Amino acid sequence: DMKLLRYYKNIWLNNKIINWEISNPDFLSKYSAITSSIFQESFNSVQNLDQLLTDLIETSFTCFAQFVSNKQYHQANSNLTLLERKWVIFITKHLPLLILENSSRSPRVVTNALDNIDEKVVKAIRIYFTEKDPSTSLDIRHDFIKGLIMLNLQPASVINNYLREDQMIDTSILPTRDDLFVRNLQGIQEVVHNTNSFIISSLDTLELESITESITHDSSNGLFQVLHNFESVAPTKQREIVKAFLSIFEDAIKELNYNRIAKICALLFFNFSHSLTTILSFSSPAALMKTLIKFVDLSRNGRNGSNGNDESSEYETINISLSFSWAILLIINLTQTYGISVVDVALKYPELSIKNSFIINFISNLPNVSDKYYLEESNVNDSDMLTKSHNTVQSWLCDLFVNGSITDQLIQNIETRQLANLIPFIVKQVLLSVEIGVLTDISSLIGGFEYFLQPLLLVGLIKTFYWLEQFLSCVKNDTISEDILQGIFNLLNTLFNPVTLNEDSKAFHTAVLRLNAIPLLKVLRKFNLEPLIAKLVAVLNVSPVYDVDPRIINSENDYSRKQLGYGKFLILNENPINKIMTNQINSFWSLHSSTYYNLDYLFELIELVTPKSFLFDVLKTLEYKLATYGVPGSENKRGSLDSEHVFDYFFYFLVLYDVKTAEEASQLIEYMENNKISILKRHSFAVLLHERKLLNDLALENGEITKTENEKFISYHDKYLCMLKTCVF
Amino acid sequence: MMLGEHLMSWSKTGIIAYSDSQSSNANICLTFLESINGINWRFHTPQKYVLHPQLHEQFFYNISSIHWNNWFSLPGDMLAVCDELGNMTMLITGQRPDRATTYEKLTMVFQDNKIYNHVMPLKPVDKLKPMNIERKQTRKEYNTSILEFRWLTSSKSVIVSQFCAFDSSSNTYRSRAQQVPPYGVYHPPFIKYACLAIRKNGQIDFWYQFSNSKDHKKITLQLLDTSNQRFKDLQWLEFARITPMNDDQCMLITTYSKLSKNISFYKLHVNWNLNDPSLKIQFILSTTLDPTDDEGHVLKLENLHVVSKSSIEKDPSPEILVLYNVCDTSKSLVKRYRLAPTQLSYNLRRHSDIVLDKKVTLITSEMFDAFVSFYFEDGTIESYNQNDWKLETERLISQSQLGKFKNIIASPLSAGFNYGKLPLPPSVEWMKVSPSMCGVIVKQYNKKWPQFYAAVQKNYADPEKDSINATALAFGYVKSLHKQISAEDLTIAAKTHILRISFLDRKRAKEFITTLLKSLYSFFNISPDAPKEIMDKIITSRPLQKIMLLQLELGSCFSQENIEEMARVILYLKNVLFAFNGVARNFHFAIEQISNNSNQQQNPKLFQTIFSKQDLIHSLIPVAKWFVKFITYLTQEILILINDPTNKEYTLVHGIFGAKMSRTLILSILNEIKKVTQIVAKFPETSYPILNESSTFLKLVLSESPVDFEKFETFLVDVNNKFIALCEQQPSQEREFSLLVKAEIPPEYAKVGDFL
């Protein structure tokens, strides 16, 4: 009963932390109703607020303990750290606020909560830190108490209670006020009394050149200092800062202010000191996606009311081009590393035109470019546009490779969407011609590729880098002479190492090289070679990269006698898929091993084996273990109630992998009782169970299946529904 | 869940080897079709066997896939089965270490775990003693789990037919056969055989055997030839379909790795030239799948089946048929892609999209037929041709009749013979359309025996469609013989339609047989009205062993009818032909061996040679008794028919004499009989008088026959001359068919019947 409660609560917290639902004001209500929902019988106990906060404290600490103490059994390079940073952010940011506006400011309850923990967590944390590395080794408990001090929750005499008996902390040194302090140009810590005004004032005077070249922290801009010093922000103030961006960003879309839109996207993309991760931790990525995709979709109507007959048009067109081009880079970074799908948001919001959405089909075909150039895709049945489609290709090739200048007429007559596909087409044709031997002059091309770096033509580089590895992978296996190979690097180095960069293109060029760097580095090392890796490692070191082996980035001289793994999930012959899933069967059945409570290592494992084979190889294999060994935890093989709770562990886990939000549960109950519902959950178990339920019922009318077999299958189905309806999601 | 696409395999010789998952003592089963009482059919008794990795000297594992070596022009007897653990067990049938055996007895070649040679003849489980073997279930998908198995053909060429058209000028159907040169990868003659298997981890295997040795060799590689073993053991391929391409020694290993979520393509190269073949691999291309349709409904990849396309078709690029299902909608989309090189002034070019109204649960590609089968949920099957993706069962309705070539028919399915209400896939363990598409094999959970469903036609009351149907079934066998298929499935389907015809009008059904078998001769460019030179070629032809067998089964229900009797006597005369002339050639060579081997009489080899010379002639005596007993039956009917010429039940006597080659065939038998007796008289046995009994008995049985052979010899000779002058009197080609098959004389030639 207690074990059931703790398992259910740990998996519930893990799922809710993954699902970005911390910002939901229903967190405490669901956490309180967990106890009543788990026990079918009525449990009418008045749980006081201190009890709720204490339960949250030990639940979070034990969950983090298991999360960090299950990592040694993983592969040493099966690196997934998004959830680790997510735990850190939650425990250091939200729980202090949960106490702040949920607690009664009782110092005793915090002492009881942090004194009731086992020493196993402390021993494991210290052992792991020592193995990774006396040097200052602070734990997550110190950061928890420090945040409470800034909120006036506890006096400065409380931190000394939990400190080691030999080392204290000076009370005066610890910050005690929640006011923003920034180092000015003269070194005085200035008080930022107003947050929104500070952002807009700095944003207006912000320089796009100061993004990556300003390695030093002594930058005159206060806002840029905050990004590199993001780890020390006050607990309550960062919520205001995150909310400040949202209100400012939505207003910029309404007013069509192109200057501030492009600058904002540059800060968020690079993710200095885990800046972008905290943003998604607070505000739900769905709302951020909706406004962001509205701009990229509704921008079509904005080009029919502007006439290029003013000297500010070239300023505006560059401002328009960069505002649109940067907004694309924000989506790709979110989709690739942060695990968000563009298709899902369109289904949830009916106001998005799926069939007429240019963004949706662009991302899914990002690494692949069409061999033919089409001005419009929905009207391929017409030939009038195809006549001038070839005209555009020859017009741009002659002007950029022979004339050496870009006429203003060409830019005005073409849209950004055609440019996003025109640039990959031309570079592919030129690069392919060079490789075969059609093009033999390099020097004219080196200057030619310089024109792709202008602010007007910046959006054309997004698809250029993705195609490179597919181009390079064939090159790696194919036999290419060094004379051609050194030429390929010469043409490539022009895009990689420009001689000069404009004040609006230097940060953009680094940003695009950061999206698809990792697979490029692996292919290049398989072979003027060093500068490309030197440039690639330089742009990889500007900010941390998630789920990457740090040995790969700095493998210049380190030789640890262990082969590097470039992927999130890695498998060897010594530890094949059999051993891990046999250890999963030992955990799916007897809850052995230590790979559980790790949805990083399990969700990817499910996909690699597919939900069908994952469920098929465990459901029917359970009987063999059950028929011989028996139900663990009971010394008597009497009754099926003991085995009933064991089945609840397996079915409750599958529910969370299917249901992700609150209102979604109320609609899946209607799916079972019988269009838009199953669209979002193509790979869910619920679809697989329901599609077989209706199909075998059809055979029941025709009588090709025994009645006993049909009764067995529905037993699994009704159990899934029964827990779905009795538990609130 | 996906069905068992490779759980069962119909061997080209009729053996149905399928996986067994219910018996606790066996994992494989063997059976075949047999006739109950000449009319009905039943499957043979299941011959159960047990396969475990330790047959070389104990728990056995489940069977993953069964692949008969029926590909291309291979003999189709060497069965190699791969278990769930990844061990490839090769079983040879029809051969024993010491002698030759029938096709229902198995034998091992080698076992893979390292590979070693161990020849051992397997025995059935039921006959074997109770052994200590339990069904251990390998519920783990190992790195060595073979995904797709493919066989390697030899350098031999295969000749098949593509289609037939109705020649309205002659009002007859015409077919053209085109030779198919080998394409893809073929193993040289000096290698006994070769095979390829792709494992789920990406590791590849290449088993081969040298024709001059018994030891087996294995060469293994891995697809992802990276410098790190971290990614070597990561390629968990969901689908790995190997389609040979027209490129020399190349196989397109179309794989879909969910790790990178892209349909990666590969190319495999092998250099045959006794050195071991060298294996090479080269990455080519990778693409991403489309998320949505045109109207805004998302898609899910259900299956990735690429068709094995030869160079015959207009665009030889293989069709990558990525199936998608629109969720909560009965529609199912099948997007088609083709791989083509990138041209200057590779890539995947999208041709079109095809929408199907029902969800698909299984796809099976037909062999040597170019037919993709869509096993929908409701049991209906819609086989789309590879050429145009036009439905075969509805092609006639939508065919543009006007043109030079009309009524293009490729299979009996084009006529309209649609399968009935098949059992629902949830209850079905596995399905497989029969090779001729005439019926479907269904294995049921509660049925201990395989079932069978045939094709039915709703408009059986319309008499005008008999002309098309007979021609459609005529071409069905034409492809089967060229592919050396038994085509027992097609025989059952033809009889059921004939039976329904005979229930209403018995007269109509008889004409259906005559028209049906006539089209076979036209399709194969063999003419029973040709001059006598071609007639000798007909007797030695294999097809008469099968085309005559057709009426042996299609005419069984007709009691007291001479349609089957006429075919059997000619067929048995062929067996009679193999008796005398089969040994007349053998006996002739024994004459020369006597003279040249007369210089060593005391050697221990001549004594056995001498004994065998006079023993062989002894075994011919029982055959000669039936030879004399046969000619008396026809002579007896002569006396009976004279008194009552109006008896229709004794019309078989007319056809026997009417057959043109039979009169010559018996004359040839009488000729060699005279030659043998003359040679025996010229060269009698003198060393051992006791051995002369067999030679003397041969002379006695001929002289003691109740009817003199010389008088009977002139009987058939005179019939030939009279039946040739009648052809010049009036030209007719149906009389040649009538005297050979119908065993009757047309009413327009009633005067000819009185002469006999």
Curated annotation (Swiss-Prot), chain A:
Q: Which residues form a coiled coil?
A: none
| Signal peptide range | none
**Key word Protein transport present in the record?**
no
Q: Which GO terms describe its cellular component?
A: core mediator complex; mediator complex; mitochondrion; nucleus
Q: Does the keyword Nucleus apply?
A: yes
Q: What keywords would UniProt list here?
A: Activator, Nucleus, Transcription, Transcription regulation
Mind listing the GO molecular function terms for this protein?
transcription coregulator activity
Q: Name one GO biological process term.
A: positive regulation of transcription initiation by RNA polymerase II
Q: Where in the cell is it found?
A: Nucleus
Grouped into one coarse class, the protein's main location is nucleus
Q: What does this protein do?
A: Component of the Mediator complex, a coactivator involved in the regulated transcription of nearly all RNA polymerase II-dependent genes. Mediator functions as a bridge to convey information from gene-specific regulatory proteins to the basal RNA polymerase II transcription machinery. The Mediator complex, having a compact conformation in its free form, is recruited to promoters by direct interactions with regulatory proteins and serves for the assembly of a functional preinitiation complex with RNA polymerase II and the general transcription factors.
The UniProt record's further free-text remark is:
Present with 2491 molecules/cell in log phase SD medium.
By sequence similarity, the record places it as follows:
Belongs to the Mediator complex subunit 5 family.
What does the subunit section of this Swiss-Prot or TrEMBL entry state? Answer: Component of the Mediator complex, which is composed of at least 21 subunits that form three structurally distinct submodules. The Mediator head module contains MED6, MED8, MED11, SRB4/MED17, SRB5/MED18, ROX3/MED19, SRB2/MED20 and SRB6/MED22, the middle module contains MED1, MED4, NUT1/MED5, MED7, CSE2/MED9, NUT2/MED10, SRB7/MED21 and SOH1/MED31, and the tail module contains MED2, PGD1/MED3, RGR1/MED14, GAL11/MED15 and SIN4/MED16. The head and the middle modules interact directly with RNA polymerase II, whereas the elongated tail module interacts with gene-specific regulatory proteins.
Designated name of the protein: Mediator of RNA polymerase II transcription subunit 5
Whole-protein coverage range: 287 to 1132 of 1132
UniProtKB/Swiss-Prot annotation, chain B:
What is the annotated quaternary arrangement, including any partners? Component of the Mediator complex, which is composed of at least 21 subunits that form three structurally distinct submodules. The Mediator head module contains MED6, MED8, MED11, SRB4/MED17, SRB5/MED18, ROX3/MED19, SRB2/MED20 and SRB6/MED22, the middle module contains MED1, MED4, NUT1/MED5, MED7, CSE2/MED9, NUT2/MED10, SRB7/MED21 and SOH1/MED31, and the tail module contains MED2, PGD1/MED3, RGR1/MED14, GAL11/MED15 and SIN4/MED16. The head and the middle modules interact directly with RNA polymerase II, whereas the elongated tail module interacts with gene-specific regulatory proteins.
The record ties this protein, via InterPro entries, to: Mediator_Med16, Mediator_Med16_C, Mediator_Med16_N
Family, per the entry? Belongs to the Mediator complex subunit 16 family.
Further comment found in the protein's record: Present with 1720 molecules/cell in log phase SD medium.
Q: Which gene encodes it?
A: SIN4
Q: What keywords appear on the UniProt entry? A: Activator, Nucleus, Phosphoprotein, Transcription, Transcription regulation
Record's function text: Component of the Mediator complex, a coactivator involved in the regulated transcription of nearly all RNA polymerase II-dependent genes. Mediator functions as a bridge to convey information from gene-specific regulatory proteins to the basal RNA polymerase II transcription machinery. The Mediator complex, having a compact conformation in its free form, is recruited to promoters by direct interactions with regulatory proteins and serves for the assembly of a functional preinitiation complex with RNA polymerase II and the general transcription factors.
Among Pfam families, the record links this protein to: Med16_C (PF20719), Med16_N (PF11635)
Domain of life from the UniProt record = Eukaryota
Where is this protein found? Nucleus
Keyword Transport (UniProt): no
GO MF, any single term: RNA polymerase II-specific DNA-binding transcription factor binding
Q: How is it modified after translation?
A: Phosphorylated by KIN28.
Question: May I ask which residue range the UniProt record assigns to the signal sequence?
Answer: none
- What is the predominant subcellular site recorded for this chain? nucleus
Cellular component per GO, a single term = core mediator complex
- What name is this protein filed under? Mediator of RNA polymerase II transcription subunit 16
- Keyword Ligase carried by entry: no
Mention one GO biological process in which this protein takes part, according to its record: positive regulation of DNA-templated transcription
